[PDB]
Amino acid sequence: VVVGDRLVFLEALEKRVYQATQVPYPLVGNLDVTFVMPLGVFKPAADRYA
Amino acid sequence: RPAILPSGQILSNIEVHSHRALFDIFKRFRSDDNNLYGAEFDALLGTY
């Protein structure tokens, strides 16, 4: 397949290899994010408006 | 006592321990069990 101004292979090894065996696939990586949220903060007396 | 000659070849390449529901009896030995060798037999010895 041609991408940009280049010629590259393009292959997925889920069928040739890894098929019907108990080793998982390596390209399914893992992202990691850490959330945060405030529990009981109290806005000052000037931002209490509807 | 497994089979001696296979009739026709299979085509699918799929793991099988997860599909043990479809079959009636299912036995998986690890590698070269020493049990499938011994072969005994009954016999009838002469008729009068």
Side-chain angles (χ1 to χ4, degrees), chain A residues 5-24:
Chain A
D5 189 351
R6 197 174 281 176
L7 193 152
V8 297
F9 277 62
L10 160 60
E11 187 176 1
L13 310 181
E14 265 180 303
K15 196 70 56 169
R16 315 279 302 265
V17 187
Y18 293 88
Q19 172 69 295
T21 179
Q22 300 310 88
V23 53

Side-chain angles (χ1 to χ4, degrees), chain B residues 24-48:
Chain B
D24 287 26
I25 69 169
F26 162 88
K27 182 179 295 185
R28 53 166 196 96
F29 50 85
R30 172 57 55 75
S31 158
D32 198 353
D33 188 314
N34 50 1
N35 179 40
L36 57 89
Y37 290 89
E40 58 86 13
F41 66 89
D42 192 314
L44 181 140
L45 276 60
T47 309
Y48 298 100

Side-chain angles (χ1 to χ4, degrees), chain B residues 4-17:
Chain B
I4 304 106
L5 270 80
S7 166
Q9 69 181 331
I10 205 174
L11 283 197
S12 67
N13 167 26
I14 190 74
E15 72 157 38
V16 62
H17 172 81

Side-chain angles (χ1 to χ4, degrees), chain A residues 1-49:
Chain A
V1 181
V2 158
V3 178
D5 189 351
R6 197 174 281 176
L7 193 152
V8 297
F9 277 62
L10 160 60
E11 187 176 1
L13 310 181
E14 265 180 303
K15 196 70 56 169
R16 315 279 302 265
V17 187
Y18 293 88
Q19 172 69 295
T21 179
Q22 300 310 88
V23 53
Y25 201 84
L27 283 192
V28 181
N30 304 270
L31 208 61
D32 270 359
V33 191
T34 76
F35 298 136
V36 56
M37 56 188 102
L39 185 53
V41 304
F42 188 74
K43 321 170 57 189
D47 292 332
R48 299 210 282 283
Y49 71 99

